[PDB]
């Protein structure tokens, strides 16, 4: 599924993410836009054999198992595939873990380079929230 700006905001909110670990809702819509274009079915292979999955592009070397990344720790205890479903529950649940470990949303290349320190509230401007 390819989410709408607004609709994802609403949903991430419903799912406990507005100000989770101190990150505004916008920080999240932002990261997801530039990470997957609101498309939950997105995947991308990195050079190290790992692959990125879903709306929030969670990695398989650490967070989820997709049965073809060796180094692999499945800290989220979910099959990668789960993170591609039209329900974002699994992805949020897992994203909560990632963001709490230690590096905040720095764990996400794209948030850091294209989201961090910009007026992220602009992503939920217009929304019934």
Molecular structure report:
- The structure is a monomer.
- With 129 residues, the chain is mainly α.
- The protein has a single domain, classed as Orthogonal Bundle (Lysozyme), CATH 1.10.530.10.
- Helices cover 32% and strands 6% of the residues.
- The chain contains 4 helices and 3 strands.
- Strands 1-2-3 form a 3-stranded antiparallel sheet.
- A hairpin with a 4-residue loop joins strand 2 and strand 3.
- Helix 1 crosses helix 2.
- The longest helix has 13 residues.
- Belongs to the glycosyl hydrolase 22 family.
- Monomer.
Quick synopsis:
The protein is built from four helices and three strands; from the N terminus they run H-H-E-E-E-H-H. It has 129 residues and is mostly helical. The PDB classes it as hydrolase (o-glycosyl).
CATH topology: Lysozyme
Order of adjacent strands in the largest pleated sheet? 1-2-3
Q: What fraction strand?
A: 5-15%
Counting structural domains, the number is 1
Shape descriptor: globular
> What is the top-level CATH class?
Mainly Alpha
What is the SS-derived class? mainly alpha
Series of H and E elements: HHEEEHH
Specify Rg, calculated over alpha carbons.
14 Å
Number of helices: 4
CATH architecture: Orthogonal Bundle
Secondary structure elements and pairings:
Blueprint: H1 5-14, H2 25-36, E1 43-45, E2 51-53, E3 58-59, H3 89-101, H4 109-114
Antiparallel strand pairs: 1-2, 2-3
Helix pairs in contact: 1-2
């Amino acid at each position: 599924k390819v989410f709408g700006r607004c609709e994802l905001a609403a949903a991430m909110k419903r799912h406990g993410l507005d100000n989770y670990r101190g990150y505004s809702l916008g920080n999240w819509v932002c990261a997801a836009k530039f990470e997957s274009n609101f498309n939950t079915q997105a995947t991308n292979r990195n050079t190290d054999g790992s692959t990125d999955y879903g709306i929030l592009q969670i990695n398989s070397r650490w967070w989820c198992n997709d049965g073809r990344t060796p180094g692999s720790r499945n800290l989220c205890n979910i099959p990668c595939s789960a993170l591609l479903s039209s329900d974002i529950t699994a992805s949020v649940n897992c994203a909560k873990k990632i963001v709490s470990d230690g590096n905040g949303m720095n764990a996400w290349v794209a948030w850091r380079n294209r989201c961090k320190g910009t007026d992220v509230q602009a992503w939920i401007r217009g929304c019934r929230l």
